[PDB]
Design a binder for this molecule. Sequence first.
Ligand SMILES: N[C@@H](Cc1ccc(O)cc1)C(=O)O
Ligand SMILES: N[C@@H](Cc1ccc(O)cc1)C(=O)O
Lengths: 370, 370
Amino acid sequence: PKYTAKINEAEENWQARAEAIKKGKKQNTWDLFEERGYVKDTAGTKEHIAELMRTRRIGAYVGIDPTAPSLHVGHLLPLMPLFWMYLEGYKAFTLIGGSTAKIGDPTGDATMNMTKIHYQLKKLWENVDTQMRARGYEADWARKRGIVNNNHWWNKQPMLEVLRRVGHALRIGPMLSRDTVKNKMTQGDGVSFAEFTYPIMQGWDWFELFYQQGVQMQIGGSDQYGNIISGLEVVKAARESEPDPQERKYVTPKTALDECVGFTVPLLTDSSGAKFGKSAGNAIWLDPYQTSVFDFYGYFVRRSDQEVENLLKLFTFMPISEITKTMEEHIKDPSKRVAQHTLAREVVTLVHGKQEASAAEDQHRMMYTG
Amino acid sequence: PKYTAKINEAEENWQARAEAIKKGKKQNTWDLFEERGYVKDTAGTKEHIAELMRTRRIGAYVGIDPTAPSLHVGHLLPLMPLFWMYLEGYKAFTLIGGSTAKIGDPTGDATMNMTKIHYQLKKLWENVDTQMRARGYEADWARKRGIVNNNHWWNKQPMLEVLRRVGHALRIGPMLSRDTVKNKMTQGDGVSFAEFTYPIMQGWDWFELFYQQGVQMQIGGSDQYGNIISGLEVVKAARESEPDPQERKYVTPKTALDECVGFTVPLLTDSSGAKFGKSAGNAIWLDPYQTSVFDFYGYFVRRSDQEVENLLKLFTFMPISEITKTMEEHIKDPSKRVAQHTLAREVVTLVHGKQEASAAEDQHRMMYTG
Ligand SMILES: N[C@@H](Cc1ccc(O)cc1)C(=O)O
Ligand SMILES: N[C@@H](Cc1ccc(O)cc1)C(=O)O
């Protein structure tokens, strides 16, 4: 009865939204992704992903392996489109790779790390809510966010079941004919069986999130394209191999838009080759105990004129009109770092909050700042 | 106290045996293996395996994947040295690959198959006991036989634990640079992830048998050499990665003779290329409902003069002196098929029992036999 009525109202709301998009009254979140610059590679055509996003209140996820006690600003990039979807009323999850960090992604303390990353994600998600309220988005019952740790299934998930459900459908050649698996096996050491199996586990992760939460979309870091391709194979195998006739009603695809999709975000460097979120020989951590707020703000205020508009698009919830006005002010006199102070203000506001942001800005407008 | 006293007497008996071998009073079972022709390839040096067998009442196993409801005579070959060890007072196991049959060994109904194979192995093991008594071997408390199904661990064994315990130690290159994995991936279809993982599961099987039963030796079919090499890596990884300090006392090797070893049996064909145990386009099944006893006996009575001594050595418990006397009678007039009737009599006696054997011999000595 009553969850059902609410689900029905949600779908009806979603469908009026869908029609509004078809008529051009409302921008498709997919086209927002393209406009702001989040799309590098897609697993699924852009027409596919657009239409899935228009017609269905999907779930989406980003996975993070807790390889250290703090996230850094480089982690923010895949999270940003995820947060945009959340603001738009999708279901959005950050998956902590508690079990999968121990294998480690080859593309190219641990419990305490897992605890700290959960804490930090919860803190950031709360700042997203704050920003959602500040940017004028209305409450929506069907809007959902969550934090999931893949140890929830990996602690007991039988190997046999994974091999039976997906292992016969996945051929090792495509896994092997992929640049990471050819790279570190030619130049660099070898690939461990555990390393080789990592993409299969991440694919099973996606299956579990599809099954449990309706997650049809994975958003990946810039180097996650191969893992996403493999993950789709794993999820497809798993949905097709479901033995129970009753579960198949729910899990086996019937229609084209039932399929899963994904995309990756761009690789961000400056014109000197530096990786975004690295300032010298260290990360810009989200933890103030590791990187002071002043220094976090500093990182952003030092961004280049050449990259700053692109970074305002990626790392803020500023409407494009707002960014355009900022850039119009900024080019009057770039030496004033209007755009960079805006970027710093917005990103600090998201990670550390408005008060910390104001204080840091005041400090960076002193006559000496380092 | 009392299992302990019995274990101590067993070890003392084993050590008098060991000294008797060192002094040449008693043949090392390893040298029996060599004399009778069971040794093709060894994982571990022959000096290693010999000394392990002299000094330690090891456990050994043969794995069989239940891919059909009956075993056939080709299955007997790896079982024979295993049965010899049993007669000599080792611990000897036949492992049914209940879970691993579903993946299937790539080297180159299902529940009912598992039930029938268990039944047949139990029946054969009982005939081994009969033969043990008939060949003059004395009761030994420490002599042990068993039938184990790897579904005992595979039904619930977590993938994560397997990957953490062995997955980092096993490199995919050696797995990949092996002829089977290069064969069916070049010529022939692909290799499924499940296929590629099969040797890891069989290696974990061996670990479970080492842990549970003290099994240090695997005997393999003629094509199982690669699987045995991989299995040793898996068992070594697993014994070295045991996290508990108390378990390490028992599971982590301390000495050279603590290591696991294995060997394979020869590939048996006749001079026309036919696979041993194939008579035309069908197997010679151990099940009388599939291959009559008459026809089973017939298969053996038709063996060639060129191969019959070799087959008496492999497929019977006849002392070498007995086989020599048989061959001395046989060469007086080969047309009488003395040696072949002896081979038929002995193998039928093992699989179907002495009464069935006598009847089949009488039938094959009629003036018309097909
Ligand atoms: N493999 C990703 C993280 C990840 C982990 C688990 C997942 O299910 C998804 C993504 C990385 O290292 O960047
Ligand atoms: N792989 C072997 C059978 C086997 C199965 C499991 C084991 O643990 C050992 C051996 C075969 O097909 O001949």
